[PDB]
Design a protein around this ligand. Sequence first.
Ligand SMILES: NCCCCCC(=O)O
Ligand SMILES: NCCCCCC(=O)O
Ligand code: NA
Ligand code: NA
Lengths: 384, 384
Amino acid sequence: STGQHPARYPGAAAGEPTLDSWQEPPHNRWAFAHLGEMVPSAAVSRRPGHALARLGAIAAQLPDLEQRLEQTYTDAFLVLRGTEVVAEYYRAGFAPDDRHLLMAVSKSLCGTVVGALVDEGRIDPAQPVTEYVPELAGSVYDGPSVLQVLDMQISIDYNEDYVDPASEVQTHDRSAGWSTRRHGDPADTYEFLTTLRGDGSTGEFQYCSANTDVLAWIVERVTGLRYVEALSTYLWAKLDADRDATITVDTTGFGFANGGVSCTARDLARVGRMMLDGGVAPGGRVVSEDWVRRVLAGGSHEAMTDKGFTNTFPDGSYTRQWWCTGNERGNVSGIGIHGQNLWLDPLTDSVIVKLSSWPDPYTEHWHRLQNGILLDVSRALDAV
Amino acid sequence: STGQHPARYPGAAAGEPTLDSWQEPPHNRWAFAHLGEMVPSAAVSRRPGHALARLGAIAAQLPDLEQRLEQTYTDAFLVLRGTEVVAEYYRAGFAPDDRHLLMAVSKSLCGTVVGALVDEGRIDPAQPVTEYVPELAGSVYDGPSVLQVLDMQISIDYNEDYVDPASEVQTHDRSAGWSTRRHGDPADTYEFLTTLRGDGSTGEFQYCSANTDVLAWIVERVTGLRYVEALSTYLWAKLDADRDATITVDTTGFGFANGGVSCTARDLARVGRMMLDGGVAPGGRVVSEDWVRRVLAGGSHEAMTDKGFTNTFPDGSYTRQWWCTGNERGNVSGIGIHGQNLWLDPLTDSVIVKLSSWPDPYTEHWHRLQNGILLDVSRALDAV
Ligand SMILES: NCCCCCC(=O)O
Ligand SMILES: NCCCCCC(=O)O
Ligand code: NA
Ligand code: NA
């Protein structure tokens, strides 16, 4: 058992509706107004081809920028200096207002929601995960603190070989609906999390997407809100965003917090703007000044043993769902596979959003090229 | 085999991507920008409870209207007189700009797209279905004309007992993704259609949702466009709609033309406005004056043997995916289970949209109440 979860709608029974019951009362009143949450759906455009390149200023300092963006399978690119959009790029076929999957940049959004609840005193990072989700007792999450989940400093037996269906990575996707279910798979994401085990050691960084879903579960238990709603209430609805964001949901309606959010590049930049504004957004304060300060400060360097990150950023670290480069510019970034970045450049009070679709989830090759672009663009914003 | 179908994206292989391949190249470039088409997803609101009742004028002639709307599980109600919204109602929890499933009102939208292609000379209703979809040879659709599909005058062995999983109604839903698949089910909607049989007789009305999906298939074969795109290009994009509409799609990306469209009440009214404007919309002509005239004129009365319809509308009929009351007002309406109506009242140059969620798909009880409301509202618009 995974305990109480926020009902899909007011008064809904646990796990209702399902793909086989949404047309039945009393579920249909809700389902008829949110069918996309139950059945894959396509947009029928209200609007009746070519790449849009408006790199403005930085174009002079980076003459071959568009080509570099093409080489890194860039779909959407936007630079926000202060409150102004100073550079934009959208591939042919991708409109400026189209939404794009954020992959793990979604994690930084989840950490932000947790941060908001910490400010309210609803979540104490020093407390064990089980203080909020007792059902995780007996799992790898029995013992570690919420902060250790936030900083991903929990050793977990997590097979990362996607080529193997038995791997935890593939199983995580199947449990959430990102891939076709197989006989024996956990019923939902909550159940999947309870099956995770580890040797009990903590303190060393281990990137694991399951950690973020545990954070979302904690958010639900402390607020009583579906993660989908909590993400809106504590973050999205305060950004004065142009469009709603979307998030994939599993069979119980639980949002895939670790990587299922989609939004426009301009709106994602509003999240960065909030971080560079001490945690304040147009609709109100999202997180405390202290939380933002802690994110920019970075996590323990000693815990960061991922050579894939430290080879590029020797003094890098990770904290509260954000990757911290530890470079001379103090760059911090939300990162997602296939080339997604919500890059913060505090020195120039700028935010760089790059949403892409590399053929591979991750290779040193793509990261070298991607980071080269983000760093060059950041430097191009320096006063001269 | 079901023949050629519009690729999900430029250059996509048949049936790609699937739930298990969307993260792989070259599918991911498209999938990352349209994930809702692959995985159930929820909206994360950009906006931070009570029913909204603005029945305006008709309120005086129909004092208990709001109560009548509540009794018929009304979610959204809107009356457009000419180009003006003269009355509106939205239940608590349903925003004026929220979208609602249209169920079979979706059929009238599909018929409109077919009508547009008839005007272009791309579709000849007198031609057999097989002239456009040869793969339907050997099925109940081998012999009948496209017009007979439009008017639903084809006898089909179609078990309507949803309580039975083997029924065609339940099988249709499973083949399209509206319900959990079962071993042996057709792979997609196209395949399901090819399994349909009948005694060969035609001429008598038989309401069958499979007919509309055949129309959508014809649309795809004649235009080379996914039905989702054709619905936008030939109709939605010409309405100057406030929001995109959405349509559920099966595993191949084929839109559920017979009942999977969702849109706002105000936008649905724009479709009615176009019909009352001789087929012209703000973005251009959608269908010919003749097509609209034929819809308002009705189908053959003798073909209409559905007592459930004729008991209320003795001179009623059906043509080109629209129900024609044949009443003294010449009312015509798009109709969907659970209380959906796109009701046309030419006498007062008005359109009435009623989107609901009755607990039951259909009962004489609900229809009596629903039609009573639509008729009373129509009469309340008459000059006095
Ligand atoms: N298991 C689906 C991928 C989740 C995103 C992970 C990442 O972007 O690092
Ligand atoms: N098989 C799903 C229902 C399709 C809608 C049918 C109707 O509204 O009449
Ligand atoms: Na905080
Ligand atoms: Na026409």
